[PDB]
Structure 1
Amino acid sequence: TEGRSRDGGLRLGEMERDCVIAYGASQLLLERLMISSDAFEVDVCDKCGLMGYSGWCTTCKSAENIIKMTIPYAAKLLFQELLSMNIAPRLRLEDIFQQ
């Protein structure tokens, strides 16, 4: 939250984000804006691409493609806001390893 009257924190604005990019700090930016700010565990079905819940995709009626991932909660909020606007932010997933 905002303000010292609600035990709030400090803003890390767009200019500070650009300044951290200017050093080549990737891990620090990931820590600041995802790990310790709004981390959230989500389940994504990598055949359609929409969010589910509790290891279940509510479109395909199956748990055959559910994958646990970590995103900011603001990302999930944006995706649901877009979905209510009849925009579908379908996610596509690749392997993190070349395998």
Structure 2
Amino acid sequence: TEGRSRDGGLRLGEMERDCLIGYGASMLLLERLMISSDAFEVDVCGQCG
């Protein structure tokens, strides 16, 4: 969620993503934006896509 009233959590914005690319940090950019925000799994049919 958003703010301090709602126990929000901070934002890796568009610009801070651009700094982590410049270091070449691949797994840290994976951990921040997938593992510790909204990780999920889906069932995908490989035939019909």
TM-score in terms of structure 2 length: 0.94
Give 1:61-76 correspondences, 5 Å limit. none
**Structure 1 or 2: more strand by fraction:** 1
**Unaligned ranges ≥5, structure 1:** 50-99
* Higher normalized contact order (CA 8 Å, seq sep 6+, divided by chain length): 1
Moved over 4 A (4+): none
TM-score in terms of structure 1 length: 0.48
Instruction: Give aligned-pair identity as a percent.
Output: 90
Question: Aligned-pair RMSD on alpha carbons?
Answer: 0.6
For residues 45 and 30 of structure 1, the distance between their equivalents in structure 2, rounded to whole angstroms, comes to: 25
Which protein has the larger Cα radius of gyration, Structure 1 or Structure 2?
Answer: 1
Q: How many residues align?
A: 49
